[PDB]
Amino acid sequence: SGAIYVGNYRVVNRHLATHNDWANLVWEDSSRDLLVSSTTAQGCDTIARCDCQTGVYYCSSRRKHYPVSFSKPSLIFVEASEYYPARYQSHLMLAVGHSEPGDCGGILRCQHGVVGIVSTGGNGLVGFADVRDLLWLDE
């Protein structure tokens, strides 16, 4: 679990979105596993606008933050689930690090601010859904 709160927006993994998220829907993209909903309070997370390939993520299954090197956003195939058939997930970055189902939603940050949220993993790998291209989150 976990979300990004920026301005009047809440960004979450689409497979974990609530009834409230869907009732207050701004935008969603199944291929990115992202959903954005509107909020009543002002969010203060800063979104990074960069091409960093290093950062720190929060890993709930370890109650710890870990430093990581991560790949550039790309199409990476993925397997099924209560959520989505076999498929390519776009705007996805991979890193060598611990993740288990339950870690989805943990924030990845670089010196510039929020980069994305944990989405996918397994085998000593962890994936992050990038949010740095969603320029509209700021305005």
Catalytic residue annotation: 15, 33, 104
Report the chain's C-alpha Rg in angstroms. 14
Which residue's C-beta sits nearest to Zn ion? 52
Say which entry of Zn ion, ligand A1B3G, none residue 37 contacts (CB below 5 to 8 A, set by partner kind). Answer: none
Contacting Zn ion (CB under 5 A), which of 1, 27, 50, 96? 50
Say whether residue 110 binds Zn ion (CB under 5 A): yes
The annotation status of 110 as a binding-site residue, yes or no, is yes
Nearer to ligand A1B3G, 37 or 99 (CB): 99
C-alpha span between 132 and 81 (Å, rounded): 26
In angstroms, rounded to a whole number, what is the distance separating the alpha carbons of residues 40 and 30? Answer: 25
For residue 107, the minimal CB distance to ligand A1B3G (Å) is 13
84 binds ligand A1B3G (CB under 6 A): yes
Contacts of 120 (CB under 8 A, 6+ apart): 33, 76, 78, 89, 92, 94, 99, 126, 127
Point out which residues bind ligand A1B3G (CB under 6 A). 15, 33, 78, 81, 83-84, 89, 99-101, 103-104, 118-122
